[PDB]
Design a protein around this ligand. Structure first.
Ligand code: AMP
Ligand code: AMP
Ligand code: CL
Ligand code: CL
Ligand code: CL
Ligand code: CL
Ligand code: ZN
Ligand code: ZN
Ligand code: ZN
Ligand code: ZN
Ligand code: ZN
Ligand code: ZN
Ligand code: ZN
Ligand code: ZN
Ligand code: ZN
Ligand code: ZN
Ligand code: ZN
Ligand code: ZN
Ligand code: ZN
Ligand code: ZN
Ligand code: ZN
Ligand code: ZN
Ligand code: ZN
Ligand code: ZN
Ligand code: ZN
Ligand code: ZN
Lengths: 317, 317
């Protein structure tokens, strides 16, 4: 997958010269230079989570997943999400399924504060054997307000916001590991396996925008595919983290042979979003974020570069 | 398909209020209000043309189709295309196929003058049984420079630019009509059937941008899905057209039972793009456009509203 994909990436980077000294030149998401502001643009699909949706005929939350994966990446550079367009490829245009998908699309756009301004629907029964949903979102951020990670310095404090559902990359691993052994109808800690796998991810637009406007913010990380590795990419300095105790479906996955080291490189492990603020702003940040979702101190940026030290687990990434 | 799709469209329009009195409010493509300019955004996929690409193992032009369908819609409102992101869903990550797709993506971005700034690739063999390519493009247009069609008035002259390949909607009809009877290897007028069906559509960015900057332009129509109906949507006035003679694969399709009336509602019939200019600017416009592709006078806007009169065919749409 990686070898083949690099042909697309390498061709794309060669097109950057076509906007050199032109409006919208490119500089989580791509930033386009519109002189008065950066336009941030990102693309993402739900992945194989729509397979579980199809098995239980529940599509009213998969649109939240698609919007969340897009808008949570936009806000990482400090951009305010503005609009989204979706790509829906289907085997057959089922009226009830489309009505279900539309419900989650509306609810997701509401929480993200965005308009769904267009898209395309492709009925291709010889090309699609089920349902495929993806989307592109655009946001705006002032030039002197981009959150890059350069301001991150040792002694900065890392704050985590609790997560909801599972992302597509980790969901692929959970499906092969848990479904053949337990079945979708297996009840684990009050929730059936398909409910654990179908549960929509969380939209963090509203608390993060309020945080940026009220608190000095140095770093913003969407804990999606890659787990804690999304935190390494922000800064060259290292981290000293005390992750929350393993719980929920992550506990069942860990009990089924996935090592802790790989748990934190694939799953969110209870933290869907991370923010980095100066030491003094801890109480200010925690008070704001907790008005929306449960937020807690995770650790700090340390001088020892690169490595993340998960203290209560003894893990180094 | 239409009944189910309206659930998505109706939900999307209900999200417009989420940007009311906010930056990027929405107002061929959607126009977002960024106060200093409109951001135009559009989405489109190649459709079933990638099925022919898979049959002959030729993918080095399908990326041109995807870019063309996006950027040709952007320029219809007068927007300069700026960037594109693509969505690639595949059964298997074939290294040679990805390298082929990348070649057409580069060439298409070059002709369109855009950067490919991102995207997502989804290897989902249980969801995709082949290859699926789509994309979203963004452009910029000043507020007082949008080409809406309101300036179109009777006696304005319609100019056509010659087309290249077939669009996805008409390609679906051609596939079922011609492949079982003739086979992909059937040679028709110097080109095999798969070559007629796989031939990439034309990118019109460069001539249309030059036209807008040098000539007074009242209307711009991308002749895609819908044929001449894309011209009706520009203005309430009617048209008096002399379309070019039927030729190429369109002639073979017409010989196989599709009536002329439906030919002009589905296929481009030799004109991929149309422009509407004041009567006086005919020679000015034709001289500019012909530096790029073959361009010719088609007719004029008339007082008798709505109806298009194809004079050399006796067709009314
Ligand atoms: N899946 C979708 N979500 C939102 N809008 C759509 C979708 N598919 C089509 N549209 C809109 O439908 C209109 C024309 O549909 P079509 O040209 O058939 O794709 C345009 O305004 C599109 O943006
Ligand atoms: N099909 C694609 N075309 C262009 N860029 C892509 C594509 N897929 C992934 N990328 C880029 O690859 C980087 C990360 O890949 P991933 O997070 O695995 O999607 C981002 O810069 C994406 O924009
Ligand atoms: Cl997400
Ligand atoms: Cl996850
Ligand atoms: Cl096109
Ligand atoms: Cl066509
Ligand atoms: Zn530059
Ligand atoms: Zn993804
Ligand atoms: Zn993402
Ligand atoms: Zn019905
Ligand atoms: Zn400022
Ligand atoms: Zn600071
Ligand atoms: Zn997430
Ligand atoms: Zn102080
Ligand atoms: Zn303070
Ligand atoms: Zn206090
Ligand atoms: Zn308004
Ligand atoms: Zn289409
Ligand atoms: Zn189009
Ligand atoms: Zn190889
Ligand atoms: Zn002006
Ligand atoms: Zn004028
Ligand atoms: Zn076209
Ligand atoms: Zn004059
Ligand atoms: Zn003149
Ligand atoms: Zn002359």
């Amino acid at each position: 997958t990686a070898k083949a994909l690099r042909a697309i990436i390498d061709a794309a980077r060669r097109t950057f010269k076509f906007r050199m000294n032109k409006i919208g030149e490119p500089g989580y998401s791509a930033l386009l230079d519109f002189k008065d502001f950066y336009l941030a643009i990102t693309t993402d699909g739900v992945g194989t989570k729509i397979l579980v949706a199809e098995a239980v005929n529940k599509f009213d939350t998969i649109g939240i997943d698609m919007i969340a994966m897009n808008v949570n990446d936009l806000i990482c550079v400090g951009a305010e999400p503005v609009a989204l367009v979706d790509y829906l490829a289907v085997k057959e245009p089922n009226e009830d399924v489309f009505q279900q998908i539309a419900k989650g699309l509306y609810e997701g756009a509401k929480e993200a504060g965005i308009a769904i301004v267009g898209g395309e629907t492709a009925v291709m029964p010889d090309l699609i054997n089920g349902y495929d949903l993806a989307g592109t979102a655009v946001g705006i951020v002032e030039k002197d307000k981009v959150v890059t990670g350069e301001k991150i310095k040792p002694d900065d404090i890392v704050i985590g916001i609790s997560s909801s559902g599972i992302h597509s990359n980790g969901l692929t691993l959970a499906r092969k590991l848990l479904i053949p052994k337990y079945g979708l109808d297996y009840e684990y800690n009050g929730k059936k396996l398909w409910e654990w796998l179908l549960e929509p991810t969380r939209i963090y637009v509203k608390p993060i925008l309020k945080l940026i406007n009220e608190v000095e913010v140095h770093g913003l990380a969407h804990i999606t595919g890659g787990g804690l590795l999304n935190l390494k990419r922000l800064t060259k300095y290292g981290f000293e983290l005390e992750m929350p105790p393993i719980d929920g479906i992550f506990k069942l996955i860990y009990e089924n042979g996935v090592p802790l080291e790989e748990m934190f490189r694939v799953f969110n492990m209870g933290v869907g979003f991370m923010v980095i603020v100066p030491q003094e702003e801890k109480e200010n940040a925690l008070q704001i974020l907790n008005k929306y979702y449960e937020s807690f101190e995770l650790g700090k940026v340390i001088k020892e570069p690169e490595k993340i030290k998960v203290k209560n687990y003894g893990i180094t990434l």
